[PDB]
């Protein structure tokens, strides 16, 4: 709600924070974001619907300082705001641009829907928002290189969930030509005060998955996340 001016204000703020992405027309960015989903049925959104926005949003970024995450948004952002040379998805133009927002159009109108928008599990899965996030996560993972770090909530009872966004799209789109190692950090939110959580079956599953792709798997516990920062 107040979505268009919010996208424009976020884009303009990001222009100022980064004089590298100053080379950006934010009305152009909003035009492409809009042309992605408006006047379409909100269950037929493909990924090429968003590709003009992806082209306007592709961004020079140190590929060896990417921090993925799955179900820990807050501590990952806390981290990337102290280790100021590492970046999450939400530190990009588009991630910063769409974070925590909701949007959807309607077939046969130029009207943005502020009434209701499709839920991903009760209605359909190819809605504007989830497809946007699928798309940007794919591209973000495709940019990564060298040693890629992913942070995981080690009190989530599936420390690595396959049907996660990280598990679904991000693990299978890290390129073995550029990435040598994926190293997980298992955050201890009081769970298993003493046990070694990298020995969890889901971490072993992720180890097998990323090793079928010719990429090394490392892992490391973080027992007390406070003094870690």
């Amino acid at each position: 709600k107040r979505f268009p001016e919010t996208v424009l204000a976020r884009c303009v703020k990001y222009t100022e924070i980064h004089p590298e992405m100053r080379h950006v027309d934010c009305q152009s960015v909003w035009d492409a974001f809009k042309g992605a989903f408006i006047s379409k049925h909100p269950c037929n959104i493909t990924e090429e619907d968003y590709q003009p926005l992806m082209k306007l949003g592709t961004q020079t970024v140190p590929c060896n300082k990417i921090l993925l995450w799955s179900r820990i948004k807050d501590l990952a952002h806390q981290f990337t705001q102290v280790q100021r040379d590492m970046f999450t998805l939400e530190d990009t133009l588009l991630g910063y641009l769409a974070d925590d927002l909701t949007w959807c159009g309607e077939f046969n109108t130029s009207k943005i829907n502020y009434q209701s928008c499709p839920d991903w599990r009760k209605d359909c899965s190819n809605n504007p928002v989830s497809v946007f996030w699928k798309t940007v996560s794919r591209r973000f993972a495709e940019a990564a290189c060298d040693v890629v770090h992913v942070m995981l909530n080690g009190s989530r009872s599936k420390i690595f969930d396959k049907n996660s966004t990280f598990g679904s799209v991000e693990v299978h789109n890290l390129q073995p030509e550029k990435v040598q190692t994926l190293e997980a950090w298992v955050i201890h939110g009081g769970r298993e005060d003493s046990r070694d959580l990298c020995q969890d079956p889901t971490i072993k599953e992720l180890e097998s998955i990323i090793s079928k792709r010719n990429i090394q798997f490392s892992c490391k516990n973080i027992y007390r996340p406070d003094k870690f920062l």
């Epitope: 060896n64 040693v147 770090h149 190692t181 190293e183 090394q216 798997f217 490392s218 490391k220």
Partner: antibody, heavy 122, light 108 residues
Framework: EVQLLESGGGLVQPGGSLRLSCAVS????????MSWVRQAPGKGLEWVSA????????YYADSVKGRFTISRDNSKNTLYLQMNSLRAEDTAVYFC???????????????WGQGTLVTVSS | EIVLTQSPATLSLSPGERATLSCRAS??????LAWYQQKPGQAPRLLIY???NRATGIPARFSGSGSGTDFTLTISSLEPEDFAVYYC?????????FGQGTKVEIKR
Amino acid sequence: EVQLLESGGGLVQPGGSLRLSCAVSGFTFNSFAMSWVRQAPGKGLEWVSAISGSGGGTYYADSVKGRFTISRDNSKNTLYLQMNSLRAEDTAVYFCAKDKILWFGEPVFDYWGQGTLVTVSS
Amino acid sequence: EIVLTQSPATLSLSPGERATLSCRASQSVSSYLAWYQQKPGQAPRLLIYDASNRATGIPARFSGSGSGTDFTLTISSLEPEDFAVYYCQQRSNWPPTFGQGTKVEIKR
């Protein structure tokens, strides 16, 4: 008291192999990447290889690819460097080193072992 | 590979002068440059890391500056124990690399 102590020594024939060891104490071994860094006598420091805290991530210098194998036993607090097909050029003091950084990646070394001389000769 | 060129090969300075040691990079390593001190027979001792931060247990007369491709270590008030070879090291990308080193003699 952070301690890094390398083991053995080394006179090998060219084309032979040997295994360098290093025992650590005074820090959580498996919380850190480690690296082997060589120095020929009278020359500079050349980095050989790096391994992650879990032992799953490894990087090698092009000089030693296909011949050297970095390795690590975390239950024994020990870092290994296996060296096969040793050449005369591989003669050097080999140094154990610990990563200062809290994760795998391009390292800076805050602690070093004392070094072991490896001599490749007939 | 990134090549580090440490610019003064040698140095003989009397105790109490300041030593200015240089380290040039072939491409930009940003701030990812550290300094090590090596005394004869000993292993390197970490002095400075990531351009300007001096490591724990290091005197304040050791200071590091620079970025992009130009870096300097400063030994503000020499002592005869400062005799050593000093190396810079980058960690911008693989592989990590060292300079050829500057050996500094203390005069008397």
